Structure formats: structure tokens, C-alpha cells
Amino acid sequence: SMGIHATEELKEFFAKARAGSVRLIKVVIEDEQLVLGASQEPVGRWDQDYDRAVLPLLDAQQPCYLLYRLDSQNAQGFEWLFLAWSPDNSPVRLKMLYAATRATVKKEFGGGHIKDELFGTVKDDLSFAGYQKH
Ligand SMILES: [Zn+2]
Ligand SMILES: [Zn+2]
Ligand SMILES: [Zn+2]
Structure with missing residues (x-):
């Protein structure tokens, strides 16, 4: 369809991430496709990994999405936080594309x-402080 799609590589990566060994997935839009911008493995607990994983990946003038893994699992696997980043300094066109x-x-x-x-x-x-206030 007309909307932006996840590439088959990004979908495959999603499945890999849910198997384990992935703390963070950064998703970005490149050439009218959703693709993998970055990924990181767990180091310590979800709370210990949080700020050092999330904050450096946030650009002052580009939106992105982060999938951030908790340590808990529900009955269909690891639980994730879906973080939407859209700083005001982003061009309006990018803000709406990401939105x-x-x-x-x-x-x-x-x-x-x-x-x-x-x-x-x-x-x-x-930030972790933000998540704790949510
Ligand atoms: Zn299409
Ligand atoms: Zn739960
Ligand atoms: Zn909530």
C-alpha cells in the first residue's frame, strides 16, 4: 500500500530480537521504508542498561522509535517498551512521517x-527518570 512498510529484514530482526540477546532496537525510516538503525545486547538488568542504551541514540533533530526490552516475560515472550521520539527541532515533514x-x-x-x-x-x-514517572 501507500504507507511506509517494514522491510522483510527488519521483520526478521524483530523475530530474532524476541528470541533473546537484544536489549534495544532502534527503528528509523530510510528511503520510504522502516529499517534497523541500531541494536544492542543486554549487559545487566533492564534498569541498569536503560539510560546508557536509550539516551545516546536520541538525535536532537530527528524522530525515531525504540523498542526497549524489559527482563519480564508474559505468556507470549519478553515484554517491551515502545518509545516514540519526536523532538520539536525536527523538520515538520519528518515529524509527520514518523507520527x-x-x-x-x-x-x-x-x-x-x-x-x-x-x-x-x-x-x-x-530517560529512566521519565519511565519511572510514567
Ligand atoms: Zn505498499
Ligand atoms: Zn506483564
Ligand atoms: Zn503507559
Whole structure:
């Protein structure tokens, strides 16, 4: 369809991530496709990994999405946080592209694996401190 789609490589990576060994997935839009921007393995607990994983990957003038893995599992696997980043300094065109495509990222990943959803426009919003206030 007309909307931005996840590449088959990104979908495959999603499945790999849910098997384990992935703490963070950064999804970005490149050439009208959703693709893998970055990924990181777990180091310690989900709370210990959080800020050092999330904060450095947030650009002051580009939106992105992060899938951040908790240590808990529900009955359909690891639980994830779905973090939407959209700083005001982003070009309006990018803000709307990312806003328009958010639901697609969640749908492709599988909403049933997502424990919670957060949004930020300043890094503090999506920091561990932000998550604890949510
Ligand atoms: Zn299409
Ligand atoms: Zn749960
Ligand atoms: Zn929530």
C-alpha cells in the first residue's frame, strides 16, 4: 500500500530480537521504508542498561522509535517498551512521517509483546527518570 512498510529484514530482526540477546532496537525510516538503525545486547538488568542504551541514540533533530526490552516475560515472550521520539527541532515533514508511521511499527512488531508506550520530545521524557514517572 501507500504507507511506509517494514522491510522483510527488519521483520526478521524483530523475530530474532524476541528470541533473546537484544536489549534495544532502534527503528528509523530510510528511503520510504522502516529499517534497523541500531541494536544492542543486554549487559545487566533492564534498569541498569536503560539510560546508557536509550539516551545516546536520541538525535536532537530527528524522530525515531525504540523498542526497549524489559527482563519480564508474559505468556507470549519478553515484554517491551515502545518509545516514540519526536523532538520539536525536527523538520515538520519528518515529524509527520514518523507520527503517521508509528502504528505500523507497533503492528509489525506485535502489540501483544509491548507492555507500555511512551513519548518524548526532550531526552528527559524518555530517560529512566521519565519511565519511572510514567
Ligand atoms: Zn505498499
Ligand atoms: Zn506483564
Ligand atoms: Zn503507559
